[PDB]
Write a protein that binds this ligand. Structure first.
Ligand code: HEC
Length: 104
């Protein structure tokens, strides 16, 4: 996917609620650094819903592809208030950006 496009998607659709940098602060949503290969609900010091805490999946390329299409379908009860990203290419660009930025 395209990291620069993915970065723009992130800035416009996610960055008001999320940071990605190491040590980034929690806002409405959790800091996302380290997300890849980690279970749901593991950002240190963030208070998740019980459903996000107990979803029990590992974040990676394919689970982010599904989740970001319709968060509340993937985790009913989530407090992430976000309709989703319908186009797979936008999702794939965004996820390429996250795999860089949350690992950098
Ligand atoms: C822009 C498309 C994004 C992307 C890529 C993500 N979010 Fe959010 N998010 C928000 C809140 C309140 C939560 C916690 C939800 C809960 O506890 O039920 C989340 C959670 C996530 C995750 C899961 C993180 C984990 O550690 O399991 C992920 C992968 C994620 N988000 C990605 C809040 C918001 C928003 C507030 C209005 C907005 C906009 C976004 N998030 C957008 C995005």
């Amino acid at each position: 996917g395209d990291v620069e496009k993915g970065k723009k998607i992130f800035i416009m659709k996610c960055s008001q609620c999320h940071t990605v940098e190491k040590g980034g602060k929690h806002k409405t949503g959790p800091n996302l650094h380290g997300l890849f290969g980690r279970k749901t609900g593991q950002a240190p010091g963030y208070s998740y819903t019980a459903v996000n805490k107990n979803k029990g999946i590992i974040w990676g390329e394919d689970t982010l592809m599904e989740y970001l299409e319709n968060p509340k379908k993937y985790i009913p009860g989530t407090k992430m208030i976000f309709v989703g990203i319908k186009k797979k290419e936008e999702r794939a660009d965004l996820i390429a950006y996250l795999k860089k930025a949350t690992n950098e």
